[PDB]
Amino acid sequence: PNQALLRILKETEFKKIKVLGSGAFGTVYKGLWIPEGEKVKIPVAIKELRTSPKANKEILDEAYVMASVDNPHVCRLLGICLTSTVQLITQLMPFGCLLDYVREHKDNIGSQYLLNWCVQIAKGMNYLEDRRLVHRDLAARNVLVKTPQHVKITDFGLAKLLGAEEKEYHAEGGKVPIKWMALESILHRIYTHQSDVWSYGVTVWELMTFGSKPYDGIPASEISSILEKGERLPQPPICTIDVYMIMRKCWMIDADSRPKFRELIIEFSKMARDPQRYLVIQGDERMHLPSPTDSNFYR
Numbered sequence: 001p002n003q004a005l006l007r008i009l010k011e012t013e014f015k016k017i018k019v020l021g022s023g024a025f026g027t028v029y030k031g032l033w034i035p036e037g038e039k040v041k042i043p044v045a046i047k048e049l050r051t052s053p054k055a056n057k058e059i060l061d062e063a064y065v066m067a068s069v070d071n072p073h074v075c076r077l078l079g080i081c082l083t084s085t086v087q088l089i090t091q092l093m094p095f096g097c098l099l100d101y102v103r104e105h106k107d108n109i110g111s112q113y114l115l116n117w118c119v120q121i122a123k124g125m126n127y128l129e130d131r132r133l134v135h136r137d138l139a140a141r142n143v144l145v146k147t148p149q150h151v152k153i154t155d156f157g158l159a160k161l162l163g164a165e166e167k168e169y170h171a172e173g174g175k176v177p178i179k180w181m182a183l184e185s186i187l188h189r190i191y192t193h194q195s196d197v198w199s200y201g202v203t204v205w206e207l208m209t210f211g212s213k214p215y216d217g218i219p220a221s222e223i224s225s226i227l228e229k230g231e232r233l234p235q236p237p238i239c240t241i242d243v244y245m246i247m248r249k250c251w252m253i254d255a256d257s258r259p260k261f262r263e264l265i266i267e268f269s270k271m272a273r274d275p276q277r278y279l280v281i282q283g284d285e286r287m288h289l290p291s292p293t294d295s296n297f298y299r
Ligand SMILES: COc1ccc(-c2ccco2)cc1Nc1ncnc2[nH]nc(-c3ccco3)c12
Pocket: 020, 021, 023, 026, 028, 045, 046, 047, 075, 077, 088, 089, 090, 091, 092, 093, 094, 095, 096, 097, 141, 142, 143, 144, 154, 155
């Protein structure tokens, strides 16, 4: 019986080394945890959404979601510290965000690494689909890098849980990225796993453009218009027509016609068997050297 459980950790065991980053909707801190008896240090990341009872209940359900998932492709919450505010604590990923990573090492990441990442994101998204929950905020920023060969998913601050007969969800209000939303979500504020398929397509578009901003010149409000026109995001340079077919099928009108995450795993894993066939990269033969090159690496 897989049920959630929250392990409370003492404030005297946390030594917040510094801060990590303030996302456009969140603030995260870097830390190093020391148990009171183990005498071993483990790097951790601390999220403190700062003070209102609406964001307090948001941390509640977010922590509930993050303390119940269990997958090597989904970063899991390990505990909650109790200070003046509520601290969420997960295991720290050394290499950090994937969006800023592919923006930093675009001339060193090969076609093999990009497809395996898409395979891993699809696996984690397929796992949280089997647990009957929608992420509602899947972007390249919310993807981290444990090792350059393994990525994870975080930030469940907008995730929701589906009931028994419930196969969808109705949003309270706005405050959603929109660029990663499906057209049905922009119009009627409805979220499904196929809306997560859309956001998955936008994430893959972010990875294949090495971190380009989708709908850059568009002033957000024009997104629903160009979506109704019939156009989507353009075709990335490295992507053949096959990969752009997968991404376009994640962005079509009917939600039921979008590919489930199961067949996305099968497709990108088949492409991962031959990376040179579907991505054309100038280098490929060269590889990046991670861990000696510090860059983003801290205890
Ligand atoms: C969007 O990124 C997050 C979103 C939420 C959390 C979090 C931590 C605890 C509860 O939520 C934590 C993170 N970030 C992380 N969580 C674990 N390891 C990490 N290494 N690097 C980061 C990171 C870099 C930039 C933003 O996050 C990170």
